Design a protein around this ligand. Structure first.
Ligand SMILES: *SCCCNC(=O)C[C@@H](CC(=O)NO)c1ccc(Cl)cc1Cl
Length: 423
């Protein structure tokens, strides 16, 4: 099957269902952006993210200076209708590449099922939505109807190559750390990709290599779906917990620290840097969060809104958290099923495992050094496909990851900025 049924053109007419101008809730004030609902609970906004953060409203560089050498600034990127057409087609292409594998089909199903928890009530007997987990669609009559959604694919802000997850917070709840979840905004662009070196000693060295191979953007997107996956199930490790990298003397020299959440998202040998004592403290911590989600679903006897039933919403949240619906009318947690789902989101959905499915050359660790960033156009099938990416089959590019070879497949890549030396 396809993940995206409709092949969207950016200049397609607005219908108010899956092609419409929309407003982001807690983005202070904004003018409407044309958005595309490519799947149930998944929208794509082909715009530079001048919205989610009040501090990121411009696309120019600030007084900021000698802090980020791994950065790239172009205020004209993603400003024309043609770029927006290729952006949304590039995101759509990468989403089918992720859907093309069993691992991606499982992560995408886990993402679509991960409805953010209805925990905005202040009465225990009432199940109410959290109002910033929605969007405001303009419908054909001209008015605004709010609609729940899980995932948003947004363009980057001023710093083009700094992809990251974003989500609005509560005044009290920590939505990505309390099992609730929250609508995730992924700053992403399919028009750029990073370089990396094939030898480990070179890739982890901040002084060697120009970036001979390029990262498959399908891996980069899937990396971010994994973060949003944990964040949509409220099991994200607090970004204050970081690991003091003592396996890279260049890292030790600068005191560079790497978060537990990203080491987990990459997986491989990196996810073993979490020593088993705090790995178990997290599972026990989030086990309790799942259970008073079950206790809250037990306390509730009324439902706010008119969109759906109380019966339907309780079934949604014992489907998301895999709670046990016995016949006491009360919901429970099965530690075995909780571990089955907690391990799936954390260990099964990793950047390293997606590499095994794509049969793709990739960075062997997250504790490396970015080397270069290229300009790419993966829209034309002569350049990139759903099933192969850059290594087109029955062609000199299919062998030896030659499609990702920026020197052998040189017309698919144009280097824009070197990161070697600036470290
Ligand atoms: S959902 C959070 C995504 C986090 N982003 C990253 O970890 C780094 C990304 C791109 C970025 O934001 N800044 O460089 C990245 C960079 C290089 C490579 Cl080879 C892969 C990836 Cl995923």
């Amino acid at each position: 099957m396809q993940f995206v049924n409709k092949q969207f053109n950016y200049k397609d007419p607005v219908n108010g269902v899956d092609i419409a101008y929309i407003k982001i809730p807690n983005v202070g004030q904004m003018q409407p952006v044309k958005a595309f609902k490519i799947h149930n609970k998944i929208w794509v906004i082909p715009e530079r993210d001048t919205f989610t953060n009040p501090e990121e409203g411009d696309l120019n560089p600030p007084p900021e200076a000698k802090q980020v050498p791994v950065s790239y600034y172009d205020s004209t990127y993603l400003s024309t209708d043609n770029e927006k057409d290729n952006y949304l087609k590039g995101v759509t292409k990468l989403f089918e590449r992720i859907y093309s594998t069993d691992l991606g089909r499982m992560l995408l199903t886990s993402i679509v099922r991960g409805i953010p928890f209805w925990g905005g009530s202040t009465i225990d007997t009432e199940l109410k939505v959290i109002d910033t987990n929605c969007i405001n669609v303009i419908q054909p009559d001209g008015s605004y109807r709010s609609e729940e959604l899980n995932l948003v694919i947004i363009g980057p802000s001023a710093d083009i190559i700094q992809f990251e997850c974003k989500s609005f917070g509560h005044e009290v709840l920590n939505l990505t750390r309390n099992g609730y979840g929250s609508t995730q905004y992924i700053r992403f662009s399919p028009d750029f990709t990073f370089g990396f070196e094939e030898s480990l000693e070179v890739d982890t060295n901040p002084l060697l290599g120009a970036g001979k191979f390029a990262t498959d953007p399908a891996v980069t997107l899937a990396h971010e779906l994994i973060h949003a996956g944990h964040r949509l199930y409220g099991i994200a490790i607090n970004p204050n917990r970081v690991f003091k990298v003592n396996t890279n003397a260049y890292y030790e020299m600068s005191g560079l620290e790497v978060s537990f959440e990203e080491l987990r998202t990459f997986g491989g040998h990196d996810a073993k840097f979490i020593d088993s004592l705090q790995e178990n403290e997290f599972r026990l911590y989030y086990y309790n969060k799942f259970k008073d989600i079950a206790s809250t679903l037990n306390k509730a006897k009324s439902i706010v809104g008119t969109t759906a039933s109380l019966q339907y919403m309780k079934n949604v949240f014992k489907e998301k958290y895999l709670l046990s619906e016995d016949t006491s009318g009360k919901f429970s947690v099965d530690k075995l099923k909780f571990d089955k789902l907690y391990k799936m989101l954390t260990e099964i959905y990793t950047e390293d495992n997606f590499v095994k499915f794509f049969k793709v050359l990739n960075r062997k660790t997250y504790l490396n050094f970015d080397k270069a960033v290229f300009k790419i156009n993966i829209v034309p099938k002569v350049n990139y496909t759903i099933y192969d990416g850059f290594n087109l089959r029955n062609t000199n590019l299919a062998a030896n990851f030659n499609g990702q070879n920026t020197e052998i497949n040189n017309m698919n890549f144009t280097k824009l900025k070197n990161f070697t030396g600036l470290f």
